[PDB]
């Protein structure tokens, strides 16, 4: 439709898993950071060349077929191919900034091969930081302080908050009644609670909430923290009588993965290629400084990113889970 795009389409007429445009520095750094960890491998880190606009669709499927009597009657109105619920992403900047003291710098520089170790260390410290900030982080507020927000809850809006304030009716936070708007503030799961066990929970959740299309899919994952998983699998091992059941770690007929710093009282069921992060093409600005006022060598780096779930009707999350007995 545009000049180059019209040419490419006319040419269409007459690895395919990740997206590249041109070899630059920020793309290379992002690719390195992805290859570092393992969880970033199973996710889409997309470079975009715009400050605000439309998102692309990945793993979206909609039934497109019908039959119409074109012979003397109505016409054929085609259905849309990529029409999602709501799609408007807004990329924003976040920046890291640190310093090394002269003493520690000298101690490290004494031995050989220190630059490579420092590079690998900062890359590893950065990737896990992306994850931790993404899964937490209700809202973004300028001049973020790390006094009362140690879990990094103020950098940018995360996937969970995206689900919370962008597409409600896909979350579960209370047991209610037609007269009792809050019959139960917390979803008790136990012998006497509102469920039998986590299996029935994830089962009826994946039955009711998510759409019938993705419901029948060869790929679904139940992202859950570490406290809840261990709380479920501990009473199994604490018995007297088969140990393979600790290797696969399936719950509710669905494979389970665990990511660090995930909130303990919630779990999100979705396909692992549906959520993604977008980053501006060339915004990785990095500067050094060697001020002696505090005898420290400091550095600043800034990058423009934005987390985004592609199709909100893909997965759903349950929040405020509490296991007990409730006699």
């Amino acid at each position: 439709m545009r000049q180059e795009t019209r040419f490419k389409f006319n040419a269409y007429l007459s690895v395919s898993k990740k997206f590249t445009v041109e070899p630059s520095v920020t793309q290379t750094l992002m690719n390195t950071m992805q290859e570092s960890s393992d969880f970033l491998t199973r996710i889409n880190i997309v470079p975009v060349s715009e400050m605000k606009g439309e998102k692309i669709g990945i793993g979206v499927t909609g039934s497109i077929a019908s039959t119409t009597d074109t012979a003397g009657g109505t016409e054929r109105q085609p259905k849309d191919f990529s029409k999602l619920a709501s799609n408007k992403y807004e990329c924003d900047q976040i920046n890291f900034d640190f310093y090394i003291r002269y003493k520690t710098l000298d101690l490290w520089a004494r031995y050989q091969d220190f630059q490579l170790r420092i590079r690998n260390a900062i890359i590893k410290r950065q990737s896990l930081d992306f994850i931790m900030a993404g899964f937490n982080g209700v809202k973004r507020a300028e001049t973020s302080d790390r006094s009362s927000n140690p879990m990094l809850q103020d950098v940018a809006v995360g996937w969970l908050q995206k689900y919370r304030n962008e597409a409600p009716a896909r979350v579960m936070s209370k047991v209610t009644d037609e007269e009792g708007r809050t019959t139960s503030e917390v979803i008790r799961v136990g012998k006497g609670g509102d469920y039998a066990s986590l299996d029935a929970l994830v089962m009826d959740a994946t039955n009711n909430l998510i759409e019938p299309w993705y419901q029948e899919d060869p790929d679904l994952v139940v992202i859950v923290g570490r406290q809840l998983l261990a709380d479920k699998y501990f009473p199994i091992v604490n018995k007297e009588q088969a140990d393979v059941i600790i290797s696969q770690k399936r719950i509710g007929n669905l494979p389970a993965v665990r990511v660090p710093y995930f909130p303990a009282d919630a779990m999100l069921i979705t396909k692992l290629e549906n959520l993604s992060i977008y980053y501006m093409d060339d915004s990785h600005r990095r500067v050094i400084e060697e001020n002696p006022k505090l005898d420290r060598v400091e550095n600043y780096e800034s990058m423009n990113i934005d987390y985004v779930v592609e199709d909100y009707a893909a997965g759903c999350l349950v929040e405020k889970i509490k296991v007990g007995d409730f006699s």
Binding site: A169, M172, V175, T176, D177, E178, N207, N208, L209
Partner: protein, 235 residues
């Protein structure tokens, strides 16, 4: 009793609640049935009166006086009034929907409470029946073990020489399981015949089950709220 007595009246409360809910349900059902069966006959009578008025007016030519005036305006009045008569069906169904939802809710609550009471009673009974009585079996099994431990008792050689404890335990397990399988439950006991039995005995158990699990309940409640906020524009 005397230890589950306070945990018993809740069964009666849930029972009364579900009974009132089912009563309201059948009342709504008979109401809508009566309304529809009356609407049919009223529409038929209106059609008959219309046919008769039309043919009588055709008989009298294109002129009329002192008659066919009150009759026609009465007929058109009835035709205007049957509109809300037919309209009441939708508000009645909308009222019945939330009623059936609450019916399923109170049903599942009563079922849960009954199961909890039965479980508590069974646990207490098994504990109190194992701790106090059945003590001669213990000394019998102790004597049997003391006998089987002797070296001139195991007919099996070095292979498969299972410990006598496991053997006597399997023996008692089999002899007890056979009895527990061949037997049955009789209702000749005051507390067990009083309130216990099967799950429940009423009309609504699974037929509707629109709410059921809390997630489906939430979806249904959201849809009902949308429908009600939409209908609030009209009557």
């Amino acid at each position: 009793p005397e230890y589950l007595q306070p945990a018993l009246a809740q069964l009666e409360k849930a029972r009364a609640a579900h009974l009132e809910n089912a009563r309201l349900m059948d009342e709504t059902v008979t109401a809508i049935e009566r309304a529809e069966q009356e609407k049919n006959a009223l529409a038929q009578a209106d059609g008959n009166d219309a046919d008769d008025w039309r043919t009588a007016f055709r008989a009298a030519g294109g002129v009329l006086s002192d008659e066919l005036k009150q009759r026609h305006i009465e007929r058109v009045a009835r035709r205007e009034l049957v509109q809300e008569y037919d309209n009441l069906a939708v508000v009645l169904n909308f009222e019945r929907e939330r009623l059936k939802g609450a019916c399923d809710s109170t049903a599942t609550a009563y079922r849960k409470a009954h199961h909890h009471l039965l479980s508590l009673y069974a646990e207490h009974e098994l504990e109190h029946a194992l701790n106090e009585t059945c003590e001669a079996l213990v000394r019998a099994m102790h004597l049997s073990i003391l006998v089987q431990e002797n070296p001139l008792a195991n007919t099996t050689g070095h292979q498969g020489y299972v410990a006598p404890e496991k053997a006597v335990m399997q023996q008692v397990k089999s002899s007890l399981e056979q009895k527990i399988k061949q037997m049955q439950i009789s209702l000749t006991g005051e507390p067990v015949l009083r309130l216990t039995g099967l799950s429940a005995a009423t009309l609504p158990h699974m037929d509707y089950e629109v709410a059921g699990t809390p997630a489906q309940r939430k979806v249904w409640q959201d849809k009902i709220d949308q429908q009600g906020a939409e209908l609030k524009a009209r009557g």
